[PDB]
From a paper:
The structure of Cdt1(495–604) revealed the C domain, which is highly similar to the analogous WHD domain previously characterized in mouse Cdt1. Although the C-terminal WHD of Cdt1 could be accommodated in our EM structure, interacting with the WHD of Mcm6, we have not modelled this region using our negative stain data, due to the limited resolution. Our CTD-Cdt1 crystal structure can however be docked into the 7 Å resolution cryo-EM structure of MCM-Cdt1, indicating that the C-terminal WHD of Cdt1 interdigitates between the A domains of Mcm4 and Mcm6, in agreement with two recently published atomic models.
This topological loading requires the Origin Recognition Complex (ORC), Cdc6 and Cdt1 proteins. In budding yeast, Cdt1 forms a stable complex with MCM before loading. We propose that Cdt1 stabilizes a conformation of the MCM ring in which the Mcm2–5 gate is held open to allow duplex DNA passage required for helicase loading. To understand Cdt1–MCM at an atomic level, we determined crystal structures of two non-overlapping fragments of S. cerevisiae Cdt1 spanning amino acid residues 1–438 and 495–604.
Residue numbers in the entry: 493 to 604
The structure:
Amino acid sequence: GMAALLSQRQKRYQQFLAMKMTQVFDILFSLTRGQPYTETYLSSLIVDSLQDSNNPIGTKEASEILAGLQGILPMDISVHQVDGGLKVYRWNSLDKNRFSKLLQIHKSKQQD
């Protein structure tokens, strides 16, 4: 019924988001590390890199995914705002294998 419909769509979205977060990580990994990047640049880059007709991703989604990734990797990725303004991200070394493990753990805690 309705509860099943809500449940099923939510589960598909959980999978989608986790997939997208791993691609966002791949995108950050491809950039020159150790310099600031604005949220605006990174979110447009995520959308431009991953979007197609059949796999929509919007600016707001990309921004939240990026924020989630920093939240999971706070020891690797920093985020700063001046007076609640534009978010600016920085990182040095990133490790995908650690990230992949942390993602599954965080997904479990949230229940995906």
